[PDB]
Amino acid sequence: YRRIIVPSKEFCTDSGLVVPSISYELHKKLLSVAEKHGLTLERRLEMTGVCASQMALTLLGQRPTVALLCGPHVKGAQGISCGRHLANHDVQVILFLPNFVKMLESITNELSLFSKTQGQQVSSLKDLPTSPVDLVINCLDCPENVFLRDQPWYKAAVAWANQNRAPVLSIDPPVHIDAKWSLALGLPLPLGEHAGRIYLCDIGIPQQVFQEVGINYHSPFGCKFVIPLHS
Amino acid sequence: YRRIIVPSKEFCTDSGLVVPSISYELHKKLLSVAEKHGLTLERRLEMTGVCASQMALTLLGQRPTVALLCGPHVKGAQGISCGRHLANHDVQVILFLPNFVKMLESITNELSLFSKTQGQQVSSLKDLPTSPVDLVINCLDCPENVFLRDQPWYKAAVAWANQNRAPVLSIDPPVHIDAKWSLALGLPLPLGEHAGRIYLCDIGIPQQVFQEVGINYHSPFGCKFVIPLHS
């Protein structure tokens, strides 16, 4: 039944527990409270990295190949963290990331860690394998970067993901490339049918943090860190 | 065969890959290099937390009960992080931690995060369940705290773990309480038969960090973050 209560969409787990959707703002505010209460950005990034990589690995089954399409924003950095963890586990990670002017700390740190792996970083779409890869991970869009959707590298990246034939995993995709699987973090946004097979990841938000932002929360995860969700 | 080469004991995986042991100093120096190369303490603590909790959960199978025996050192903090993650997943976590004078940052932060969960923190052994719990997790000992072994709370804690009947998981135990399972981190120390069923956890050390401390490394994990090891 309904264990989580929010003050829009409604998903359920394999056990039929109802996990509701939350607005983008409520999601950001929840993340802002956690960070004040200890769970830093680089702590979330590390965990998201691990858990996302663990899901990606399950989806994977010579070494498999994963294409990583990240943007110059905090959603992109999540993908990098994920990419790094996969590269650790003998997966051929090739990460696409466009160059930028004003440096982004989250990206800075995650790239630096990525450097030390055998994963490959590219700033071109033409440096990616012509032959379909095993999995494409998409972290191209941050909802606060409204105008970045019109970019030539953006439309060209979108074009690449769609021509490769490889199935797409979208980590923390926007509400509004067809993803085969989409991964939500902590709590889902009201994700549409465009999102495909929807999963929810645990980012280690303590139960009392939810109650502070007015959410009666009871963990829908059981004993898994990534769970499938249904409509 | 032998993929990892070190410049003592030798374990092998289910696939028969040989993973060798490393000295405590080499282990600390490896951790010291990673931290310089980006992977901070709180990043390792977060990941160790997740992966250790994931193992503990596998060992677990009304809500199950886990007793958490942590010391006032960085090994203790690992246990707290683990405890916090379990408490997130509807496990009854009761954490034993003795009071101390000079405050320990790692513990400070992890306790603060633990606070926000429904997990219970105690400084007494008499506050723990009289009826055997489902699992006891032991992080009582840091090898640099030589003299802390003689402590009255130490000998009394050791006494508690042994009288409960519950199986013991020792996360990052010393080389020299009988653990049913012991978990090593990144690379194992030459752990003796006293350690019991030995597993190796991934703490997200990039391949190039190993080569800097003179270790030709190839990931023994395959696609798991915790693996069993054999002699």
Curated annotation (Swiss-Prot), chains A, B:
Effect of residue 46 to A: Abolishes homodimerization and RNA binding
Location (main, coarse): cytoplasm
GO process terms (BP): deadenylation-independent decapping of nuclear-transcribed mRNA; P-body assembly
GO molecular function: identical protein binding; mRNA binding
Subcellular localization(s) per the UniProt record: Cytoplasm, P-body
Keywords: Cytoplasm, Disease variant, Intellectual disability, Phosphoprotein, RNA-binding
Keyword Phosphoprotein applies: yes
Tissues expressing the protein: Expressed in theca and granulosa cells in ovary, and in spermatids of the meiotic division part II and apical membrane of Sertoli cells in testis (at protein level). Also expressed in brain and mammary gland.
Disorder association: Intellectual developmental disorder, autosomal recessive 50: A disorder characterized by significantly below average general intellectual functioning associated with impairments in adaptive behavior and manifested during the developmental period. MRT50 patients show mild intellectual disability and microcephaly.
Free-text note regarding domains: The DFDF domain is unstructured by itself. It assumes a helical fold upon interaction with DDX6.
Family: Belongs to the EDC3 family.
Name this protein carries in UniProt: Enhancer of mRNA-decapping protein 3
Organism expressing this protein natively: Homo sapiens (Human)
Boundaries of the shown chain within the full protein: 258 to 507 of 508
